[PDB]
Structures are given as C-alpha cells and as structure tokens.
Amino acid sequence: AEIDEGVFETTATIDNGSFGTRTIRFETGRLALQAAGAVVAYLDDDNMLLSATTASKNPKEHFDFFPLTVDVEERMYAAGRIPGSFFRREGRPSTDAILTCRLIDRPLRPSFVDGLRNEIQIVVTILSLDPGDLYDVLAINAASASTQLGGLPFSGPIGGVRVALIDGTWVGFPTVDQIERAVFDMVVAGRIVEGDVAIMMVEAEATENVVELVEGGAQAPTESVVAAGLEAAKPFIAALCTAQQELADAAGKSGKPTVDFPVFPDYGEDVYYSVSSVATDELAAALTIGGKAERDQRIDEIKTQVVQRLADTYEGREKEVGAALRALTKKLVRQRILTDHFRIDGRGITDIRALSAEVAVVPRAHGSALFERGETQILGVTTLDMIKMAQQIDSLGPETSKRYMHHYNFPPFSTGETGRVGSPKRREIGHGALAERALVPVLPSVEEFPYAIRQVSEALGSNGSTSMGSVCASTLALLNAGVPLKAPVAGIAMGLVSDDIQVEGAVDGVVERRFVTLTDILGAEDAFGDMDFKVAGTKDFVTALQLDTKLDGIPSQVLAGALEQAKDARLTILEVMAEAIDRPDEMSPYAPRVTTIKVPVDKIGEVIGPKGKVINAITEETGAQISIEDDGTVFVGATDGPSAQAAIDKINAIANPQLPTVGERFLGTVVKTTDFGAFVSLLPGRDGLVHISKLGKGKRIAKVEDVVNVGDKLRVEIADIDKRGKISLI
Amino acid sequence: AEIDEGVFETTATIDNGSFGTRTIRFETGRLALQAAGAVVAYLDDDNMLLSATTASKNPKEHFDFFPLTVDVEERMYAAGRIPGSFFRREGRPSTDAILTCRLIDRPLRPSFVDGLRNEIQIVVTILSLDPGDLYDVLAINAASASTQLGGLPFSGPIGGVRVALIDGTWVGFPTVDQIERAVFDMVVAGRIVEGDVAIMMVEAEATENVVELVEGGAQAPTESVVAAGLEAAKPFIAALCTAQQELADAAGKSGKPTVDFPVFPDYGEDVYYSVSSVATDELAAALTIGGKAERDQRIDEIKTQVVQRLADTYEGREKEVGAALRALTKKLVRQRILTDHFRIDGRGITDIRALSAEVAVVPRAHGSALFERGETQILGVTTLDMIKMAQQIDSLGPETSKRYMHHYNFPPFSTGETGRVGSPKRREIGHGALAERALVPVLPSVEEFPYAIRQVSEALGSNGSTSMGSVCASTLALLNAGVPLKAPVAGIAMGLVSDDIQVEGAVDGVVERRFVTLTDILGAEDAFGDMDFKVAGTKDFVTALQLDTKLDGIPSQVLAGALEQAKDARLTILEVMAEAIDRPDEMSPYAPRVTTIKVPVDKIGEVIGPKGKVINAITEETGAQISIEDDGTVFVGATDGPSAQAAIDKINAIANPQLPTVGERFLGTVVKTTDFGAFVSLLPGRDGLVHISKLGKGKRIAKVEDVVNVGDKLRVEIADIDKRGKISLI
Amino acid sequence: AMGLVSDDIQVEGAVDGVVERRFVTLTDILGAEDAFGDMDFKVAGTKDFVTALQLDTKLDGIPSQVLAGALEQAKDARLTILEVMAEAIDRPDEMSPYAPRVTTIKVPVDKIGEVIGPKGKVINAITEETGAQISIEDDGTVFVGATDGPSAQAAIDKINAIANPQLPTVGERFLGTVVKTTDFGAFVSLLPGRDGLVHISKLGKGKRIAKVEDVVNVGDKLRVEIADIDKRGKISLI
To answer: Closest Cα of chain A to C58: distance in Å?
Structure first.
C-alpha cells in the first residue's frame, strides 16, 4: 500500500442523498515527479485522470497578456477500443475535448495574480473512463489541485460538481442514466473564501427529453429551480474545496512560495497617481453631459490633449499611460452607472436595443435568417439531408451519433479587423457548442422527423456577445426549413456591475448595492462589466446559462430579478419573432423528399439482401440516392416530389413479394421467359412461390420438343393466391 | 556508359558470396543541375533515387545549433499504384519515411565542421522501387555522395550497407526473401579515415520469426556474431566509400572549395584561454571534493566570480562564457572519469541505478506498467482489439498489414519545461519505432493468438535515455495483457567515453586506453559521452541495437566486454522483472473475448450469406452485438463479465454444436419447396436430404394428410438402422 | 511562353510625337526577362488548335494589332518544338508489361446478374483465389481487371473457357467424372450462382420410369451431351 513516504491520499465523500454514494480520491507524488504538481483523481475507483502544471523558468517579455494554455490529452485507450482513423492514432482533439478545454480554462484566468508572464500550461490526460460517466467535473477539480500543489501563485483551489434536477432532487456527479432521467443538468465551479463559497462559474443545460418530462409531470425549470440548484451545489463545492486544502496543507507545501514570480503590471502606481491627479475632474465633467452625438469625439480629444500634455514629461513609455486612462475611465463609468445608471447608448437599463429579423433570404438554401439585433448581425442557414450523413464522432464520451450539429463562423471581415481564415479557434467551438446545447431539447424526435439538420451561424458583424444572436438565427432557420419545433427558442445577454464605491461614506457606513443588470452588453460594456449570464431558453424553461463571476458575486437576492429581466427580454424578442414568423413553414421542395416507411426487421433480407447492386443504377436513373443504413430500416428519399413518389412506388413494387391485393400489379426485373415452365429470379437464395395447378389448369406436360405444339394460345391467368405459404388445393 | 560530355559515373560492386551480385552505380550531372550536388543511385539497374544538397547563401544569425534539415519525398509513383487518400496525393510522410529520415540525419551531424550556421538541406526522392527491396541504405549512400559532390564543408564521404546473417553467412543489400529467411538484419553506416574504416552508426534488428528459425536449427544471435557482422560489413563500407571518393575526385572537385563558408564558433579561443587561466586548478580542486550536495552552490559561486572579473572586462559577450565554463567542466569530468574511475552517482561503474516495477495500475485498461527506473519514470498500456481494425499503411515498402503498433508519448510536463503538445516530432517516432522493432520478434503469431495489440508508452518524467524504459514497460504491458510472450525482453542504455589522457608523462605523451563503459546514461553523461548503444534483448539473443559513435571509436577489443556488461544489466533487470511478474496473466473480462473456429470457405454462401445482418440483430436483441468476420473467428464485443460469458457460450453451442448422435431428438421445419425438391436446414456441417418416395414405406404415395388425422403424435422414431446411415422424416 | 515589352518611348522627339510602338514580342522568357517584362502569354496547343492561354497585361496594353503577330510567333515556336517532339517520339509506344494490363469486355445486363449479380462475397472469393479485382456497374459497361499481366491472361482464359467454351469438332468425345450427384438432377456448375433443371423427357433418354425403389437405384450411369452453344455465352439445353 502506502509503505513509502510521499504518496499523500485524501477523500471527498458525497452522500448524494438516496441515489447512491460516490467517492472522490486525490493521490499525489506517485506519478509525474518532475512536474510542479502531479495530483491524480479517482471516481468510484474506475475513473483515473492525471493533472500536471509546469512553470517556465525563463520569463517572457514580448507577451503582454497571461499565456495560460490548457489542453486535455483525451487518449483513446481509456476505454477498451482502438482509434478508427486511417493512421490508428488519436489526432487533433475532438469537439468534446475542446469543449472540456474551454470548461477548465474559463474559471481559472480570473483567479490568478494580475500580470503574470511566465508560460503556464495545465495538462489533463485521460486514463480510464467507465461507460455512462462524463470526464468534466473531476477533470477541473484535478487541474485545480495540480495548480495548487505546484506552488504557483494561485488564489485558492476551486471545486467543480455537476447537479441535475432528477424528480425534484439534485444529485452530484451523475451518470448517463440519471441524466436521461433528470430534466436539467449544469456544471458549477466555485471557490470558498472567508468561510463562504462563491459561484465562480456555471454552465447549464437542458436534456433531450425535458419537454416530455414537463408534459409527463415535472417542474418547469425557471429562476427558482436554478437558484435551488446553486444552493444544492454549494455544499458539494465546499466539501471538494476542503478536501483540496487538506491535501495541500498535508504535504507541507502551498505556504511560503520558495520560487518567486516576477510580475509585469501594465501601469505603475506613480503614473497612475499622476494621471489621475492631473485628469481626474475635467474628463468626468465632459462625460457627465452625455451629448450622445459629439461626446465620443470630446472624450477622444481629452485623451489626446492629456497624452500630449504628459508625454513630454516621460519618454519611452506609451502603453502604461493608455492603460492608466483606461482605468480612469473605468472608475468613472462604474461610479456613474452606480449613481445615475446610464448606458453607453444613453437609454434605459431595462430595455433591449432595437432589433429586426428577416426570413427567407438565401435563395437555394432550405432556410435562412437575418437576426439583426442592433449592431450584431447573424446569418443562419439550415441544410436538411438524409439520416445517412450526420456527425458520427468516436471518443470516450457515450455520445456516438449527433443528429443535430450546429457549426459556427467568426469570419475576420465581420469584426472590422484583418486575420487569417481556416480552422476555427476555441472560442468559436465554445460558442457553437453553447448554441447547440441550448437548441437541442426543442428539436423534434427521430421517428416523427427522420432527417439530418446542419446549421451554420455565420457572423456578419459583431460588437459584443454574439452567441445569443446565433441561437436566434438557428431557431429562425429551423422554423423556415420546416422542422416542427415544439416551441421557438430565444436568447439574450445579461450584464451586471458590482458595488465597489459607497455613498460618500466618510463617517456613514452604507452600501448601496445598486446591482444594475444591463439588458444588453457591448464590447466596451463587457470590457468594463463585471458579470455576465447570457441565458437562453423558451417561454417556459431555460436551456443554457454561462456565468463567469470574477470574485465574490454571491448576490443571493437580486439573481431572481436579473433572471426576471432576462425572461422579459426573451419574451420581447420572441414577440418580435412571432410578428416576423410564427408557425413552422411548409417544407421547401428544394430539399430531399425522404418519406419514412415501416418494414419488418426479418424482412429486410428480402428488401435489400446481402448489400446488393441495382440500387446505384436506380439512383442514377431516377434519383433514389438511398444507401445502406446502419439502423437497417431503410427510409428512401428523392430530391423531387413526383420523383420521390415514383421511387416509393417502384421500390414498394420491387423490394417485397407484395400480396396480390386489389389493383396490385407486379413490376420486377423480367430477364427470362420460357415455355417449359416459369422462374422468378428475384433474389438469390429464395424463389417466389407458385402453384402448379393454378398455372397449368390441372394438366401436366410430357415433352417440350414434340408435345408442345406451335400455336399454344396461353390464356392462363392466376385466380387466387393465398397467404398460407404452401401449395394445396381441394 | 558515357552518353554525354560532363556526366561522370562509376560503379560499386559487391560479391555477397554465392547469394547473387548486385551492382551499385552513381552518376552525376544528368539531373538537378542547379542544386549543389546531383547524385543519383542505382541498384540492380531497377532502383532509382536522386539526392540533392543546397546551401543557403545568406548566413543565419539567430540560430545557435546546426540547422541540417533532411527530408525524403517518398513519392507514391515509384511503384505502379495511385495514392489511396481522399485527395489522390501523398500527404505527410509516413512512418517508414520518417524512419528513413532519422536514419539519414543521424550519422551526418557529427561528420560536419563545428559551428556551422548556414542552412543546409538534403532531399532524397524516390523514383522506382522493385518489390521486396528496402530504400534505406542506398539512400544514405546517395545522400553522402550528394553532400560530397557539392563542395560543402564535410568531414568525408560515408558508406552504408544493410548486412543480414543468413545460415552463418552475411549478405549485403538483401531483398525481402533472404531477410525473412535470415535471422538478424543490421544496417551499418560508417566512413574510412587514414586508410581504415570506422563504424559510425549501427541499427540492429530481429526478424518476425527469429525464434522459430533459431529453434529450427541456427545460432543464437549473440555478441560474437554481432562482432562478426561488423567485421563482415567493414569491406562493403570500404568499397562504397572508395567508389564515392573516386566519383568525387574524378570531377576535379572536393579539393579546395571555391565557395567558402563563414563559421560561428560557440566560444572564442581568447575567452577559453581567460576562463581556463582564472579557473585552471581552483575549479578542479573545488570539484575534487565530490560533495554532490553544494556543488551547484559552488559552481554558481564560480559563475558569479567569473562575472565580476570578466564581464566587466569583456562586455557584450556572455553566452560564450558559459560555453567555456561547460566545455572546461566536461574536460575535467572526462579526465576524472578516466583517472579516478567514477561517475556522477559516486558508486561503482558496473552498478545499475535503483529501479522498481509495478503491475495492474490503470484500472479499466487491459494492462499497465510502472517501470520506474530511477528518475526516468515510464508508463505502458495495452489495448487488445479485433483484427478487422489495425494499421493498414500503404507505401513503397513491402509491409502492408501491421498487427503490433507501438505508439509513444513525450508530453511536455515530463522534463520539467513547457512545450507544445500535438503531432509528435521525429525523435518520438524514432524511439517508438525502435521499441516496436525490438519487441516484434517475441510477440506470438496470428493463428495462436488472433488479436490487435496497440500499446502507448506514456512518458511521466524522463531525464536521459527513455526508449529502453519504454521497451520494459512494453513487455510488462504485454505480459499483463494475457498474450503468451515467448520470453520477456528488456534493455539498458550503455555509455562509454574515449581516453584522451596519458600515464603522467610530464615530457612525453603516451596512450592509456582504459575504455570505461558506463553502465547507465544520464543526459549530461551522453552529452559528454562518445559512445552509446541502447541495446535490448532477451536472456538468449539480442533484438535491437543503436550505435552512435562520435568519431574514431573503433574499439575492436572491448565491444564484446561492453555488450557483456549490457547482458549482465539486462539479466538483473529481468530477475527483478520476474520478481514483479513472471507468467502471462489470465485474460481480463473487459477485453473482447474472441474464440477460434474454422468453417468451409465454399459453404458460407448457402446459410452464412446474411452474415452482416440477422445474427447481429438477434444478438443485439439478446444484448451482445457480434462483429462476425468472414474468416470464421468469432469477433464479439465482450464488455460485461456475465454478458461475455453467456455470449461466448451461446456462440459455442450454436455455431459449433457437439456433433449429432443417433437417437438425438430435435424438431426442425422446412421452409423452401419447389418442383425439383426441398432443402433441409437443421445444422451446419451436414445438409440432410429428404424425399417423397420413401415417405410411402415402399409404396406409391399421392397424398400424406390422407393417412394421418388429428390426435396422432409425430414422435421422431428410429424406424430402422441401415448400413448406409441415411434416414428420412415422418 | 511569349513575352513582349511596350514602346513607351518615341523616336527622339523632345517635342515631336511619333507612335513607333515597337512591340517586340520576345519568343522565350527568362526569369529576369519576366521580372522586367511587361507581357506574359504562356500559350500552349497542338498543331491545329490552341488549348490554354494566360494573359497578364500590366497596364494600358491594348495592342489590338500586334497580338496577331505574337500569336504567329507562338505558333512558329510551337511547330518547331513539335518537330523536335516528332524527332524524339512519334506514335504511342507498346503498352508496358510492368503496368497493370486491364482488358475490358462488353456483355448485357443479364450476363452480369448471372455471373456476379449483386456483388456478394463471391467477387472477393474469386479475387483471393485468382488475383483479379473486378469493378462492375449496371451502366452497360463491364470492367474486368487483374493487376499482373499473367493474372490478366489467366483471367481472360477463365472467362473464355467458362463463358465461351470452344465448340468441339467431328469425332471427338469427352469423358468426365462427377464427385457428388443427386436424384432430382445434377448440380453441374454450368452457370455459377444458379442451379438449373433436367426435364422429364431427357431424364431417361427416351425411357419412362415405372418404379422408384425396386428398379431405379442411386449410382447409375448417365451421359450428358451439348446440344447447341451460342456466342452470347449461354448454354441452352433442351
């Protein structure tokens, strides 16, 4: 066992009520000795991931941001399988790997000492994944433990758990079974400070059967239930963080940092003091008028005047004074928004910016959308095709066949600046994943609507948040394409500014926490904002959330009000949508007309046979571009409507030995006809059953050469064909 | 022939005894006129490669190493075939191309003028490759000729041949047939200096059936036969290098270079004199204590004092100072490892550094290994799967279907420095290929153990040599995986330094040639070493070897002793290794439990025709999807223990039932009937036949139902036992 | 490739203006000539008709009268290089044995369905047993292939010995042996993938059958003779 010193193990016990108990263990020191921090993780004792963070000794100069680059080596051998690629090796990390990478990276950057320059990378390699489990929460927990153990400057460990509303109860670290049983899952990452846990980050979800459960008996996910879920997630985070700190202080490390890290602040305190003291009041006075027409030009001219005024004094320093002006205008806009609460546009705080939506723009495509909310412009397009082609990833997760894949784009010409175009970055994948995760539950079932949907959310220009516009374009396109949505979906971005300055407060202690939740966020608004939710859902139940608290948010009182404002914005957006388009439109004939049919499973051997030919010939000659389906039950389709109907008739005629019903005719492949009998060579192995006396009128033949006379008028017609499957007359 | 004025050609003849003679020819000037070097190569007038070397005129400053970038354009059209990729074009060079790239790049860097910075690239393209031939040795020979002809600063031409021991005889440049017949194939590359050949590189091998040949009558490949192979390869190298030299000096070139090359010495001569003078004997005396604790403190003390007596004196020159310190340090440690006969560890030379091994670490995977030799900690995991999926590369080489693929990993957090994780570099591929080539001979055959083995050698912190640890972890993962290895195999890196020192001699200079063979290598040890083997083999016969002599090694007396030291090291490894685990373990349930069965090929098309369907559907309804392969092997997905056991049981009881006996009662049914008879399908392996004439008990029978009415029991009765053993139903 | 330079200069003329547009079309281009050139064609074609062009006017070219002459110069150079061609090689050479000699045949759709049909595992079995890969489409064309030239002659031999047996001459008889028979008929592999029938007229060679068990036994002697063979690859027995 642990006979040697250096392998420090701990436990993280979670009850999860009466739905089973799972244990989480962190063991350090046995592996990856050289890396600064080598914690591993255990769930149920059948899950194993190893985390490691390594600090570059040589500091970086040309960098100006924090170069924290996280990555997950999602090795294929954790489950008992071999990669299916042409090279038999894991390639570039898949979509789920990049999603988990963004999941781990997001609640780590704010919790770092400002202005760190030495390159820091966190590696989380997967080693064993039981089926039905997700490698998200314990991965981020392990990474937090790893960066904690290494002695890096870190503001305490962060825990991460998944909760799920299953039958009115929340469970931690659920498996796929309860995830299907539950109606609403979210990940929650947080840190405890001063004895209270603060929700650093939460990424929500709606399952693939939430509508059925809500109709079948459940509670509609709303602000109350998500608040309850946060409350239920708090104790699990507390337990995880306590376990992490027990591990950290057990090793005797994470106390005094033996290795110091040179910090690179953007601006000095002296230049800050000088700039603020020389330009504290005139800039505020010029801002307070808010001309809304030339106020911007006035503020630029103040920046120019101040920078020429204090650029002669100090030579060779340019960026720091710009950052100092940024911080100045920062403090002024926050005090202004906490005292009189004006937005950059100058209008109210509880009203959405002007918007407009158009439908049926792209001519040939099966759908279109021009959701044009203010400056943000998003174009969405559907492309319906046969269930033959769809997302078919292979990875450690249990997901195998994605019917609905939601691509995305951030072309450089949209933002207003140049840049290379090619493989999308991680932000693109994250936003597209959020859009798909938000729009999945309302999409219809497979059986009612057997089709493959692909949605591309082109971004034709964007100022701030742009994923919600992508969701709106996606729903517009889905209704225009003919997909029978259960309920149109919509999204909106929700900001919030904290209270850093009180009312005067020289002798009076009062905290006017005027938690202004701005109805929408601009790029500058997100720059000087402190909070963001970006919720999205239908009229009744939310679908996605993304909260990225910097620190010590914990409103616990106005979160309901912010959710209510988001809900009001969502209903306004949906009302404008309904004024634009309301009901699922008729399906446009340019799409392939695939009509489902029902056949017995054992009868497929007669329908398709041993993967036979002639199917491609009929595809070329008529347009029956159907191929071998994985499910077996074949749904043939054709692009043109009349062609689709003709295909239905001819395949229904050729594939089956159809009963001689009323008006039934036989149209097969007649290659040979002879007079010494008859043969139906439909498919090898089996032959069409015939009756000897119903064809020969109860008379036999002796010879073919002499007996068969030239002149035999064959007035032979079948009278009755029964379904017994044998030959017997009276 | 001389078919042009200015095109010079020559020959390279080899006897190869009675196993055929293959002429080798190089002709220059006919192709690639513009590049500085235009050598092409011929083997048996049916193999063609063209080698070119181009020197960049503009010097490179920011570079500090030698930027010799070599690459082989393994053009797919050398054989008569088209690339099978989605774009019909050769993509990134395949594994064998990278292997040849490392094969050529390895014994060229030492044979260059020190401190060269001008970019030099060698391109070796393929044009024709007869099947059964390997494009390795003539490629490096042609590249050597190309670099010699171009007038580049070069030590001298190098020759390389592939020599294989067959039936006690060595044959150079063999085809695949003799290679399969042979038991040991070696590629030797070296130059000739002062009239004597010097072996500059060796890369050994063991064939795919070496053990069966050696047990069928042969000699076990040992140290003596390795020395014999080196001796037999010497004349071929001599002849090849002679041909290269006559080709070069025939052109009138390769004497005084018209084009000169400016060099960038690492450290200056004067700074070397200064550093030596200030730290001649003080540094030696300080290091003589061998404290091994504060040595870093005192060398940094020397560094700071060197700063304060030279950096003020000489400014703008800092890196070459440190180069001087490290060169002088390597000089002292070399002379001391000669005189005092001790290494960095401080203990005996013929002593293996501490080690430990563990088994069954990764829970879910089919195997594991924690070979933890000192600092270099390595991990290995097996993953058994079906034959249908495996490596199926297409290239010029005759290898098509690879069963055992041995991946490798060098994650950045291992060494303790940051890095970019993604596509592996050339060193990763080279080490992984060496490991796979060392392990392949002992792995069992297809028929006894039909499985697809894929193993990854994760590196969890490595200091110096790490491929041998990968091989050890490989044999552990295979042993724990359940595959019956013929004999476990390991290997230990072998170090050795030359002797520039003398026996005292205050006035004369003598030769004291005590070749101390370091039995383990650290990174610094190989940095200031001159000899490294990395041998690996079982108790009886070696499998791999990698010799990389710096220059003028030619021991010829102690190579056997060093190999015996390696033999003792690997015997100690294997003893501890068996102390860890000895015999192949029982097969783990999580693996796909495949059984072995045989079927008539001609008879599959009657009842086994469905194959891809029907059976899969029913066994998925019963909960075990089976991917039955056409070869007869039962490829079934065996995930759960009880499920897998029931699956293999039903399969064994359904596909190969115990052969029927007289008196067995089973109730079958007929499904097909026509005018020419009826097919009876009861069991595979015997197609029973029935008729209607015998159904009348030796009397004419027009109808059957007329005799039997309701209430009669159709008990299967043994009416009579005839000598023919043929009966009919009732 | 044809390259020309525009005459931006006049004949002296400090004040005189003469349009002496010496549009010199350089018949061959070097790298430096392209660098300081002003016109690129890269025209290519056969003796009769051109195929490709690539025009790269820098600025204000519009010759409209000397492009014809440039094309004639290109045609002359093309004819010269094609004469050098003809001196080098003239007619398509012999089809090299090393490359895969694939020979095609044309048969109707009915022949395809009988021989292979739905492309089951029989195609793979034939490929493994002989070494010939066959790609068949129902568009009317029949591609039958084998990589090696010897494999190709083996494949054509099997096709023209199974589908198209040679018609025997007068006086020759062939004696064959069967490995397993039946009573319903013979499982002779005249057409793969299909089993025929033997009529009641020729079962007894003109003899009626009276008793099944008492007289007729299993293991009797039966001879088969060909009636007629067509060139369509059929074996019609009546």
So the answer is: 28
Q: How far is CA A390 from CA A381, A453, B381, C182, C203, in A?
A: 16, 8, 33, 52, 59
Cβ contacts of residue C135 below 8 Å, gap of 6+? C143, C145
Residue written as token pair 């552990």: B476
Q: Which residues contact A293 (CB under 8 A, 6 or more apart)?
A: none
Burial class from Cβ neighbours inside 10 Å (0-12, 13-18, 19+) for residue B277 reads exposed
> Which A-chain residues 133-152 have CB contacts (< 8 A) with chain B?
none
Size of interface A-C (CB pairs under 8 A): 48
Query: Measuring CA to CA, how many Å separate B451 from each of A80, A163, B445, B594?
Result: 13, 41, 9, 8
3-class DSSP state for residue A491? Answer: strand
The helix/strand/coil state of B27 is: strand
Token digits of residue A462:
């964007």
B640 reaches A (C-beta below 8 A): no
Q: Which chains touch C (3 or more CB pairs under 8 A)?
A: A, B
Query: Is the Cβ–Cβ distance between B249 and B145 less than 8 Å?
Result: no
Q: How far apart are CA B413 and CA A38, in angstroms?
A: 10
Q: Is B11 buried (19+), middle (13-18) or exposed (0-12) by CB count in 10 A?
A: middle
Question: Measuring CA to CA, how many Å separate A586 from each of A371, A478, A592, B529?
Answer: 21, 12, 14, 78
**The residue type at A501:** I
If residue B666 lies in a helix (H) or strand (E), which one and from where to where?
Answer: none
Residue window 593-612, chain B: list those with CB within 8 Å of chain A.
609-612
Mutate to test the interface with C, among B34, B672, B693 (most CBs of C within 10 A): B693
CB of B163 within 8 A of CB of B66?
A: no
Reference B452, options B387, B406, B368; nearest CA is B387
User: Is B308 in contact with B302 (CB distance < 8 Å)?
Assistant: no
**Best to test chain C binding among B676, B695, B697 (most C CBs inside 10 Å):** B676
CA–CA gap between residue A353 and residue A334 (Å, rounded): 21
Task: Give the experimental resolution in Å.
Answer: 4.0
Residues 6+ apart with CB under 8 A from B514: B338, B341, B499
User: CB within 8 A of B295, min separation 6: which ones?
Assistant: B287
Q: Which residues of A touch C199 (CB under 8 A)?
A: 676, 703-704
A471-to-A370, A375, C11 alpha-carbon distances in Å: 12, 16, 71
- Distance between CA atoms of B548 and A259, rounded to whole angstroms? 39
Asked whether A452 and A384 are in contact (CB, 8 A), the reply is: yes
Whether the CB-CB separation of A198 and A216 falls below 8 Å is answered with no
Could you give the strand order of the β-sheet that contains A12-14, starting from the edge strand earlier in sequence?
A12-14, A22-25, A40-43, A47-55, A120-128, A68-73
Q: Which of B330, B337, B318, B306 is nearest to B298 (CA)?
A: B306
Nearest to residue C136, comparing CAs of A651, A612, A634?
A612
Whether A668 contacts chain C with CB within 8 A: no
Name the residue facing C122 among B80, B605, B611 (closest C-beta).
Answer: B605
Q: At what angle do helices B319-339 and B295-306 cross, to 10 degrees?
A: 140
Residue A333: which of A518, A550, A143 has the closest Cα? A518
* Residues of B with Cβ-Cβ distance to A77 under 8 angstroms: 365, 381, 383, 454, 456
Q: What residue of C is the nearest CA neighbor of B601?
A: C125
- What does A101-113 look like in DSSP terms, one character per residue? HHHHHTTTSTTB-
Pairing state of beta strands A536-537 and C44-45?
Answer: unpaired
Placement of tokens 């499904």 in the chain = B671
Q: How far apart are CA A498 and CA A475, in angstroms?
A: 33
Written as one letter, the residue type at B73 is E
